[PDB]
């Protein structure tokens with residue numbers, strides 16, 4: 001039996017793979033100057049579900065003839081703690097990738113949260129979200145949905161299934177049930193629509209594919225697709241395959257992250 | 262006649278997971294590994310431009326606060342009908358509610374001010390929708406807007422750790438489990454520290470002006486540090502040690518539209 005204290009103080013507690021990285025405090029841990037290249041967009045990121053959203057988006061824009069959507073891509077190693085460097089924290093004080101700088105204009109604009117970066121780029125160039133209120137709203141319903149759902153998938157299911165030191169039954173069941181509910185939701189939606197927000201591929205599809213599409217394609221945690229009965233979600237699976245064959249998606253996944261040190 | 266979207270105005274990990282009747286505490290009857298409608302339900306639709314199907318939770322109060330801030334700012338067209346969706350009763354799985362929000366979470370909003378109604382779900386998206394509709398509580402310049410959105414999306418991506426992680430394991434799980442509690446308490450504290458440090462530098466989360474991002478953040482973190490959420494949690498988290506966050510939380514709690522949003526009455530649907 002573990003005793004719950006009145007006031008929590010276990011700063012040194014085991015956090016699995018991210019022991020040392022995870023802390024009860026935020027902010028800068030060391031001085032860091034990040035490189036800045038010539039392209040309008042500087043992307044400080046890593047090839048994770050959240051990072052690939054942004055390279056995919058940029059490649060989709062490039063593939064549609066938006067010539068300004070070129071970017072410099074730099075590797076932020078989250079296991080090394082690069083996300084706690086002074087320059088990175090300036091861009092994203094939450095110390096998570098992806099983080100972006102738009103230096104197309106007079107002064108650079110810092111953008112973080114992967115879904116927000118997708119929205120920012122979509123509105124800047126008028127691509128991959130409808131310009132009519134009804135269509136825009138439905139994309140946003142699902143884009144925000146993804147932002148609020150993925151934490152359970154990655155931070156709940158993924159953590160306990162793959163990165164916690166012991167396999168803990170109760171958390172795994174709790175978070176697996178939620179992951180399945182989410183998969184079932186998306187499957188049932190995609191049984192009625194070509195893409196998540198209707199007839200047209202959108203930033204919501206990019207956001208959702210990067211987590212749920214890769215998941216059911218068995219590209220994420222080892223054994224997870226099988227554990228979750230991924231193949232049983234036929235409409236989600238068919239949509240994930242369709243999106244995986246887009247050239248911009250393939251280029252987004254294959255993008256080269258340059259060293260910062 | 263209800264909502265009409267068409268009409269005019271040591272444990273062994275198995276190889277494949279199998280569900281169970283596993284006791285999740287309070288929400289065991291309700292939670293399932295599938296989504297969708299569970300029964301037929303016609304929701305009331307009133308006369309006001311905004312129909313809000315919700316409950317007085319951290320996610321729900323964001324929207325009543327927003328609507329009341331808009332009204333307090335002179336937006337006479339931001340009146341609403343407010344209806345109680347009981348999440349313990351499973352009202353969120355009724356046919357009309359699922360038609361507005363297939364994810365079956367409150368809050369969900371119908372904007373029937375235009376020619377056809379527009380369903381809006383996700384509390385943060387509802388805030389953004391209302392802010393853009395009326396041009397208030399988000400800046401119109403790109404830099405100002407982007408900073409608000411950074412924090413609005415942040416809130417949406419962070420609250421699951423606070424409610425679904427910390428809240429659940431601290432308050433709702435039948436047993437107090439050490440590893441989950443330490444994981445999610447540490448993350449909650451990181452979030453509180455992050456916010457405290459921002460609010461030491463700025464009057465509101467995105468700068469000198471109050472925004473939808475403050476509403477979204479306050480509704481969780483503000484209420485949390487004011488000891489209004491799970492019993493013992495503010496003490497457990499050392500909430501009073503976050504002095505800039507706590508002062509900001511008090512400041513916003515004193516706003517008249519915030520009080521009115523908290524006090525709103527949720528009408529019965531059945």
Ligand SMILES: N[C@@H](CCC(=O)N[C@@H](CSSC[C@H](NC(=O)CC[C@H](N)C(=O)O)C(=O)NCC(=O)O)C(=O)NCC(=O)O)C(=O)O
Pocket residue numbers: 018021022048049050051078083095096097098112113114115147150151152153154155158159418419
């Ligand atoms: N909502 C943000 C999430 C960004 C994010 O999670 N970034 C991760 C890498 S993506 S890789 C997937 C990621 N895992 C992690 O971040 C692992 C570390 C974490 N501290 C932990 O203990 O779980 C995850 O589950 N995310 C949940 C979600 O998407 O909402 C990161 O930089 N981590 C650095 C750190 O934590 O120090 C967004 O969409 O931009």
Ligand SMILES: N[C@@H](CCC(=O)N[C@@H](CSSC[C@H](NC(=O)CC[C@H](N)C(=O)O)C(=O)NCC(=O)O)C(=O)NCC(=O)O)C(=O)O
Pocket residue numbers: 148149288291292318319320321348353365366367368382383384385417420421422423424425428429
């Ligand atoms: N991202 C959505 C979340 C909305 C939401 O979570 N709504 C809750 C009530 S807010 S009350 C706070 C809420 N808790 C719950 O939803 C409790 C029920 C849940 N199934 C469980 O067992 O954990 C929570 O932790 N939220 C996490 C977050 O905000 O990201 C709901 O309708 N639940 C019905 C259901 O689950 O069937 C939003 O911002 O609108």
